[PDB]
Structure formats: C-alpha cells, structure tokens
Ligand binder design. Structure first.
Ligand SMILES: CS(=O)(=O)Nc1ccccc1CNc1ccc2[nH]nc(-c3ccc(N4CCNCC4)nc3)c2c1
Length: 282
C-alpha cells in the first residue's frame, strides 16, 4: 500500500553518455521509447546496500507524488536488474549554479544556447529564475516538505529559462564535514538548536536569492566553514550584491531574521518576487 511508481522497460532506455556524478551515483543523457523517441536524464545508483534499495523506493515514491510545475518531471524507475535507474526530463542547461556562473562577468560571452543571450541576464530574467524557485518551495511547504539543501546547485535550468528544483535529500566547501552540512545556507536555529522547519527553508531561499544576484558566488567564500558559522550565529548578513536592486535585497533581509516567526512566509516572498518580475525596477 503506497504510491504507484511507473516502472520503465530497460530496453526502452538507451544510455547516450554520462552527464555527471553525485553521492547517489551517475546521471546520463539517454533516449526513452514509448513514454515516440525522446531524450531524458537517467540517474543510476551505486547501490551496494539493502538500505540504499529502501531509500530508492522512498525517493521514487516522494518524487512520484510531488509532481508539479516547478519540480523536475519524474517519469518512473527501472528495477529490472542492477543498476537501479530513475528517469527524469532533460534540462539542457544543467544545474542553476553553473548556468548563473556561465552568465557572470568573469565568463564574458562563453555562455551558449539559442534561448538566452550570452553574458549577464536581464533583471527580469534574474527575478524570473528567483520567482520560479520560490514557487517550487511554496508547493513543498504546502505538503509540509522541508528541503534541507536548498541551493542553486540543486536546481535545474531547461529550454527558455524554465527553472525547477531538481534535487532533494561530498568534497565541495558548500558542505561542512561533521553528516555533511551546507552550513553556509543554514539559519541560526539549524546550527544552534538543530531545528529545520518551513521557516528554515525561507532563510535558505534568501541565500539562493543572493546566489542568483551574485551569478553563483559561494556565500562567505572568503571565510572558512567555522568562520561562516560564527557570522551566521552572530547576526552578520551577506553584503548586497553589485547586481542587486534594494527592493530585492530587502526581500533577502526579510528571510535573514534571527527569529523564524519574524521571517515572511514563502508564499509572500514568491508574491513580492512575482510582482517585481512582471515589473522589474531596473
Ligand atoms: C548529481 S549531477 O550529475 O550534478 N545532476 C544534478 C545536477 C544539478 C541538480 C540536480 C541533479 C540531479 N540529477 C538530475 C536530475 C534530472 C535532470 N534532468 N536533467 C539533468 C541534467 C543534468 C546535467 C546536465 N548537464 C549540463 C551540461 N553539462 C553536463 C551536465 N544536463 C541535464 C538532470 C540531472
């Protein structure tokens, strides 16, 4: 008894090549038949655990029931032989962090694609990406879902700057080696009391908002993991980005209140973000 997970025939999936590697294993570009031929992203678990076979069904069940407009489209699994496979839609731009970086001032005009100009994005484009991520967080907050790793590296960019949350729950400085913590995105109540609620995600979204307007710079990049923990817990906030209007900064400062109850809800942050997106101050 639980969520009916769509199973896919292994012979209906032809692996093209590796797109990347993660904790879970490897991601590939592939063709999928009978879902007409169609390009898709496929995750392959490294397995070698009976437990990891349990986390697979868990994630597959949550993904199958969390389907929405700003969450990466999940098509089903393949348990017909090791390795286990998760099939998703293909977001041709890859993760939001690398996308931002490729449109930043250090990148000059090396960004490609036919859908977006190389070099910096429009203010209205930056607020579109921000608003799309917020909307995905509003949906997850609705189902009492808490994202413990909200960061631009866990979002995907598709054709026409469609941004979705691509990843949910070990060598980058993003994560502190303890359990790996992405402390730099964590509010004080998570570092100090080990609490993570909906309001925690509102604080994390503020950092995502900062990441977006810095073109994917790492929060407190000048500081170590412990130095960042000191700042966060002492009330020191990130500097406004060069490319950030005060109305956006103000939204950021609204997520960075020490008292979680003194933070605006994610539905209000979305709303303020959607508004500006339809009317970018510039
Ligand atoms: C763990 S990973 O290989 O870095 N994949 C990944 C990256 C960012 C956010 C989420 C993931 C999780 N895997 C995943 C899930 C659904 C996906 N749909 N499309 C992709 C996808 C992933 C990567 C990708 N590229 C962009 C071109 N550079 C090579 C990698 N193009 C599309 C994808 C990945």
């Amino acid at each position: 008894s639980g969520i009916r997970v769509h199973h896919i025939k292994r012979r209906d999936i032809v692996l093209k090549w590796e797109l990347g590697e993660g904790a879970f294993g490897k991601v590939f570009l592939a063709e999928c038949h009978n879902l007409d031929k169609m390009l898709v992203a496929v995750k392959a678990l490294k397995e070698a655990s009976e437990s990891a076979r349990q986390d697979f069904q868990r994630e597959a069940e949550l993904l199958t029931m969390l389907q929405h407009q700003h969450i990466v489209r999940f098509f089903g699994v393949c348990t017909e032989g090791r390795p286990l496979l998760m099939v998703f839609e293909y977001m041709r731009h890859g993760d939001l962090n690398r996308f931002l970086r490729s449109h930043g001032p250090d990148a000059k005009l090396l960004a490609g694609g036919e859908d977006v100009a190389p070099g910096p994005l429009g203010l209205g484009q930056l607020l579109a990406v921000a608003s799309q991520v917020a909307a995905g967080m509003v949906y997850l907050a609705g189902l009492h879902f808490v994202h413990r790793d909200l960061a631009t590296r866990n979002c995907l960019v598709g054709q026409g700057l469609v941004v979705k949350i691509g990843d949910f729950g070990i060598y980058s400085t993003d994560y502190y080696r303890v359990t790996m913590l992405p402390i730099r995105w964590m509010p004080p109540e998570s570092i100090l009391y080990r609490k993570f609620t909906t309001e925690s995600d509102v604080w994390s979204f503020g950092v995502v908002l900062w990441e977006i307007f810095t073109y994917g710079k790492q929060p407190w990049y000048q500081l170590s993991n412990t130095e960042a923990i000191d700042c966060i817990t002492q009330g020191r906030e990130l500097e406004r980005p060069r490319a950030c209007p005060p109305e956006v900064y103000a939204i950021m400062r609204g997520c960075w209140q020490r008292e979680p109850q003194q933070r605006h809800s994610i539905k209000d942050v979305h709303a303020r973000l959607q508004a500006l997106a339809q009317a970018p101050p510039v």
